[PDB]
Design brief:
The chain is built from 3 helices and 7 strands. The chain has a 7-stranded antiparallel beta sheet with strand order 1-7-6-5-4-3-2. Belongs to the AHA1 family.
């Protein structure tokens, strides 16, 4: 499978604590994705979101600092996971979120970029009021 790497940076009007909670709380994920979610906020823990269209496993969780996960869309080749790292940086009580994704199927680059920008970043900002 040819793959690609993407890097996204987004600033939120909330603290790293609050943003990290949004990414790692099943009921908050349910709210911003508008769908039932299951999320085990543990190293080794599984997640399943948007009618099972997104799934994966957390491989490193450092509260308020970083999340590393194996992550896929349901349509990707079976057993194919991207590795996504989210880093939470405090900038004056606001949060700079750096997302780095590796191992994204190359045909899926724009779907995955737009999915992250619209369904994570815009979704979180609009649900919780974390700025434009």
């Amino acid at each position: 499978i040819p793959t690609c790497k993407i890097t996204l940076k987004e600033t939120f009007l909330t603290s790293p604590e609050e943003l990290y909670r949004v990414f790692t709380t099943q009921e908050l994920v349910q709210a911003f994705t508008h769908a039932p979610a299951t999320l085990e906020a543990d190293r080794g823990g599984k997640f399943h979101m948007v009618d099972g269209n997104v799934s994966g496993e957390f491989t490193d969780l450092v509260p308020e600092k970083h999340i590393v996960m194996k992550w896929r869309f349901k349509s990707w080749p079976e057993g194919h996971f991207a590795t996504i790292t989210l880093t939470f940086i405090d900038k004056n009580g606001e949060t700079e979120l750096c997302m780095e994704g590796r191992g994204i199927p190359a045909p899926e680059e724009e779907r995955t970029r737009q999915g992250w920008q619209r369904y994570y970043f815009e979704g979180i900002k609009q649900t919780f009021g974390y700025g434009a």
